[PDB]
Amino acid sequence: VNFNLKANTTYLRLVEENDAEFICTLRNNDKLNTYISKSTGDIKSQAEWIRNYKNRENNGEEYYFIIFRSDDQSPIGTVRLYDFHENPKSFCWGSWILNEHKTKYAAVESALLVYEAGFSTLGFEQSHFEVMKGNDKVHSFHLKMGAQKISEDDENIYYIFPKSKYKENKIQYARFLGKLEHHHHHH
Ligand SMILES: CC(C)(COP(=O)(O)OP(=O)(O)OC[C@H]1O[C@@H](n2cnc3c(N)ncnc32)[C@H](O)[C@@H]1OP(=O)(O)O)[C@@H](O)C(=O)NCCC(=O)NCCS
Ligand SMILES: Cc1cn([C@H]2C[C@H](O)[C@@H](COP(=O)(O)OP(=O)(O)O[C@H]3O[C@H](C)[C@@H](O)[C@H](NC(=O)C[C@@H](C)O)[C@H]3O)O2)c(=O)[nH]c1=O
Ligand SMILES: [Mg+2]
């Protein structure tokens, strides 16, 4: 598989070992890491993590992306598809982080491109993810895009996002993915 994920103000490309420093700094930013897993601040350890990730990637088991800002080709975050299962075909996503240099709507763009990757490039039927209780605006983002709370525990709310909502959204969110081929005009 190779991916061609590009939206209006952002694009994605697969993580390499050399992204270790950017990732370490991102994930150890205390403004950003309130609701994600603790991870090493050691560049070589993060390089190690990426090396193992690359084996999972070579086997079609995981795809991990740096998010970039299109205007200056500068890195603005991460996102990951992982933990694949069957009956029905399901993928998780997460590791979803954008820094201060993000474009205003990078969150909308990157989510949409994740669902491009999962449902159309990779053929999944269903997406699973969770969000910490307390991460209020993230809950509110996913509900708005059409995710459904399946359930919960002491830490998380658990969601699914169906392929049907992705397709059904592709028209509605088309302005985020590219230049419109034609624009609505009212008389
Ligand atoms: C999670 C994260 C990537 C979300 O990015 P964000 O930039 O915070 O996302 P926002 O919800 O603010 O969305 C960006 C903009 O698009 C708008 N928007 C969001 N969803 C939209 C939708 N469905 N339709 C139209 N506009 C939308 C927002 O209102 C916002 O614009 P605003 O500046 O006018 O409010 C980011 O907050 C982050 O890195 N958080 C820390 C790490 C983390 O907790 N990750 C998630 C673990 S579950
Ligand atoms: C991606 C990555 C992970 N790790 C460590 C951290 C942890 O010890 C282990 C497994 O990591 P995780 O699976 O928990 O990855 P993480 O990036 O922390 O994100 C996940 O756990 C968080 C607590 C959840 O909030 C994340 N959920 C989301 O981001 C869902 C999104 C759609 O809103 C979920 O995807 O690996 C690293 O050391 N380096 C890395 O680059
Ligand atoms: Mg490409």
Automatic annotation (TrEMBL):
Modified residues (Cysteine sulfenic acid (-SOH)): 24, 92
Alphabetical UniProt keywords: Metal-binding
GO molecular function: acyltransferase activity, transferring groups other than amino-acyl groups; metal ion binding
InterPro entries in UniProt: Acyl_CoA_acyltransferase, GNAT_dom
Residues at which CoA binds: 96, 98, 102, 104, 135, 137, 173
Pfam family, one: Acetyltransf_3
UniProt keyword Metal-binding, yes or no: yes
Binding residues annotated for Mg(2+), in chain numbering: 3-4
Boundaries of every N-acetyltransferase domain copy: 11-148
Alphabetical list of PANTHER family matching this protein: GNAT-FAMILY ACETYLTRANSFERASE, SPERMIDINE N(1)-ACETYLTRANSFERASE
Record protein name field: FdhC
Organism: Acinetobacter nosocomialis
